[PDB]
């Protein structure tokens, strides 16, 4: 008849960093950091975004002929461009207060 | 650790406990086995759950944050926007990593504390009925049953 | 690419569907997302130090 | 708590102790009553006064901060101003709610430590000439007066 | 401090110790000398070196921070620039003095912890062969060699 006080252990190879020691092996832990994403553009609360695609803001708003598929788009939850959003202004000059117009939109 | 139980006088943790974070390995003549202390386990779990809640609750959700575009004669207000976005991101990353090092240490201090508070609680019951033998292990003078072991678990065993 | 998925949070790389307080995917966000930080590990301990005695 | 005296080995605090945060109860033949331990009370008050000073004096007073005006073609510098004010207020509320929850737990740990440092100090003075009984209380072996009971308070009584 | 060993039960530190932060002093028939307990001192030096590295690592080196001119009709954007520069410098000065006061308290508590861990490992080792005198000093009941004092440093000591 003996009685021994002790603490828990397991097979858990979880690790955490402290001020005293880095990568201390621990029985349980959870990550507060997120790294997972769908890899996809998705609907924001059941409503689909506008995808400008081959066009930018200025080609849609002026109604550039290469941006005619974007002219019937009434509503969106957010607006998306791509790295190849080159179909904008189709005759040279300048767009006065462009930076403010996309900020309104 | 800090208080001196976790890798301290108690040499290692036992995989025979799965029921809780703190427990008693009884070694009766009626048979050996492990039995977790539900009090120190649940007090630790409640304190950990409130720490897990607190760190997530203080992190109020990030809303829609989009990049601002500026023209060729707006390089200063671009570098002000860059300085603002970088300088906030530095502070949020810095507070996130600083708190993680501090709270992981304070949690290991807290668990070492809970083994110590449990050890002294059992020692104050086994006064002149037992001697300390294995740094956690007590050896009884009169040999008592699994009922008398459970009396030591639940906070009774008032014997001299 | 656009797909018939739904989400509460979007980024330029893809849609996050999590309740964790921080993220490290992209600073640009739409909707209600976790906080962008440059961290690679913000793992908090819930248990004690594992010493299996094996 | 952490140190295991406040709601730990001492079950509760006395409402007859008002003179200091730490002290002693009389249970001698010369009658009951309370006498405060001024050294544990004053060192706790000094630590509390310095942490109260620290948390207030680190916060250097806010000068005049007023709203800024923006026309219909200045929505970018309006939303940049707003992002700066909101992002600073997020960090400020976050640092304030970190400090208050952390340092309230450290204050409980600090006071719980001062009850340990007092109890172990009286145990090391009393030794065999008094034994622990009422988890805080010490039964005198040979028995002695309120002068001898006072001598334990002031840091003398070096009797085996 | 927070564990009652430094400035507590041991009255003061020894200037004849130079070998380490925690150590013993024997008074054998073989003579006297200060000899550090290596394992506790080195473990403390690792804990201090890791915190010293961490607080230097967590800040990232300040790149080119150059002042920006604004004309007579851009004084709002100068007051945005100045508010951003001041508000970041406020927060970073507050973070620096926060972690200095907090971690300097935790350092003294950590060393005080390591001195009580050094005393309690010797108390549990010497057991029935020695009593307390100067609170730290252990008069033996059998008189054993400086080899047997080294057996208390390494923590073997084969006699109950």
UniProtKB/Swiss-Prot annotation, chain A:
The chain holds residues 18 to 122 of 565 of the full protein. Disulfide bonds join 55-67. This is Hemagglutinin HA1 chain. It comes from Influenza A virus (strain A/Puerto Rico/8/1934 H1N1). Glycans are attached at residues 10-11, 23. It comes from the Viruses. The lineage of its organism: Viruses, Riboviria, Orthornavirae, Negarnaviricota, Polyploviricotina.
Swiss-Prot record, chain C:
Disulfide bonds join 9-33. It comes from Influenza A virus (strain A/Puerto Rico/8/1934 H1N1). This is Hemagglutinin HA1 chain. Glycans are attached at residue 17. Coiled coil: none annotated.
């Amino acid at each position: 008849d003996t009685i021994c006080i002790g603490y828990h252990a397991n097979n858990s190879t979880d690790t955490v960093d402290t001020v005293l020691e880095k990568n201390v092996t621990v029985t349980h832990s959870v990550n507060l950091l997120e790294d997972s994403h769908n890899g996809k553009l998705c609907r924001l609360k059941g409503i689909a975004p506008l995808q400008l695609g081959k066009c930018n803001i200025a080609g849609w708003l002026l109604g550039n002929p290469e941006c005619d598929p974007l002219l019937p788009v009434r509503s969106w939850s957010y607006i998306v461009e791509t790295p190849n959003s080159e179909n904008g202004i189709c005759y040279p000059g300048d767009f006065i207060d462009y930076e403010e117009l996309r900020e309104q939109l | 650790g800090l208080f001196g139980a976790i890798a301290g006088f108690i040499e290692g943790g036992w995989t025979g406990m799965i029921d809780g974070w703190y427990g008693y390995h009884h070694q009766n003549e009626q048979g050996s086995g492990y039995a977790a202390d539900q009090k120190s386990t649940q007090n630790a779990i409640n304190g950990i759950t409130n720490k897990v809640n607190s760190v997530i609750e203080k992190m109020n959700i990030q809303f829609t944050a989009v990049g601002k575009e500026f023209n060729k004669l707006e390089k200063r207000m671009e570098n002000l926007n860059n300085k603002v976005d970088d300088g906030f991101l530095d502070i949020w990353t810095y507070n996130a990593e600083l708190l993680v090092l501090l709270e992981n240490e304070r949690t290991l201090d807290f668990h070492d504390s809970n083994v110590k508070n449990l050890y002294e609680k059992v020692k104050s019951q086994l006064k002149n009925n037992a001697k300390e033998i294995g740094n956690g292990c007590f050896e009884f003078y009169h040999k008592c049953d699994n009922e008398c072991m459970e009396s030591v678990r639940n906070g009774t065993y008032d014997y001299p | 690419s656009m797909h018939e998925c739904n989400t509460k949070c979007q980024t330029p790389l893809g849609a996050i569907n999590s309740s964790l307080p921080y993220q490290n995917i992209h600073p640009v966000t739409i909707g209600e997302c976790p906080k962008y930080v440059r961290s690679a590990k913000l793992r908090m301990v819930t248990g004690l130090r594992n010493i299996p005695a094996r």
